[PDB]
């Protein structure tokens, strides 16, 4: 059945082997579904990222089809560009744009962002989500680890491996998917859900940007999920460290009832986003600069 799946993937990916044109693979990241290396394009000296995913090590192998088609068919200023995909032995390799600024996690765990910076991140993420959600694509794993940066502070959404599509014929999803601390309550409750789950997860990322970590982060994942499911929306550890504007914004994201939660389209009009700085305002937060 692994052989069965390898054959299926071969029909969908690009032919060949990118080892023929790439040099000096260096591992830079470990994900939930595989590893990520930087590589040098031999002809150009340009750098790319290569996500390598072993078909034998997935919970749901068929989710790998998301890695082949989403980045390629849903392109945007604030979404990581994919170049090509290949079957290399037992692994799916995706060659994609290298986001040399690394992940937002490295910033939120090591420094404090001001509200100009938080708004810039939120604006970039919401622009991506408004376009994806209009097309029925739900990301389902929004967290700081999924937000990548360029050297010049541009913010891009990555890691669509666990995404799903909704449409008139399939208006909601049911799968238990995401990262425990960031999961929407309706998703934890196993109710049919839609794009709204990404907005909740974004609110949890706003808490990451303010506090350094999501709520209940010291609890075991299962216990955190119970608490998210059963409790009032999680509170900031330091409410005095956020403006009434940022609190009002957050109050539109962390709404338990998905019907009352703001949509990405609606949030793009929120006065909090008026504070967003240019990508330059993000630059000094990155490791190479701080």
């Amino acid at each position: 059945s692994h052989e069965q799946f390898r054959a299926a993937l071969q029909l969908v990916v690009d032919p060949g082997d990118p080892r023929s044109y790439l040099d000096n693979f260096i591992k830079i990241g470990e994900g939930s579904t595989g590893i990520v290396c930087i590589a040098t394009v031999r002809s150009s000296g340009k750098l790319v990222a290569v996500k390598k995913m072993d078909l034998r090590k997935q919970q749901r192998r068929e989710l790998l089809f998301n890695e082949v088609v989403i980045m390629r068919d849903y392109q945007h200023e604030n979404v990581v560009e994919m170049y090509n995909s290949y079957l290399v032995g037992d692994e799916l390799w995706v060659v994609m744009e290298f986001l040399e600024g690394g992940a937002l996690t490295d910033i939120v765990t090591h420094t404090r962002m001001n509200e100009e910076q938080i708004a810039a991140v939120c604006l970039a993420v919401l622009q991506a989500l408004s376009v994806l959600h209009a097309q029925g694509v739900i990301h389902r794993d929004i967290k700081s680890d999924s937000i990548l940066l360029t050297h010049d502070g541009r913010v891009k959404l990555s890691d669509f491996g666990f995404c799903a599509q909704v449409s008139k014929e399939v208006p909601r999803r049911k799968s238990l998917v995401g990262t425990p601390y960031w999961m929407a309550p309706e998703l934890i409750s196993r109710l049919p859900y839609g794009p709204e789950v990404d907005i909740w997860s974004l609110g949890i990322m706003v808490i990451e940007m303010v506090d350094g970590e999501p709520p209940y982060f010291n609890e075991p994942p299962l216990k955190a999920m119970k608490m998210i499911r059963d409790n009032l929306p999680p509170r900031l550890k330091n409410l005095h460290k956020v403006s009434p504007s940022l609190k009002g914004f957050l109050d539109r994201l962390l709404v338990r009832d998905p019907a009352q939660r703001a949509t990405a389209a609606e949030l793009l009009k929120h006065p909090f986003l008026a504070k967003a700085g240019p990508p330059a305002s993000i630059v000094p937060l990155m490791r190479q600069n701080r």
Binding site: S32, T105, D141, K143, L176, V177, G178, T179, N218, P221
Partner: peptide, 6 residues
């Protein structure tokens, strides 16, 4: 304190 997806 785990960050792994499910």
């Amino acid at each position: 304190r785990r960050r792994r997806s499910w």
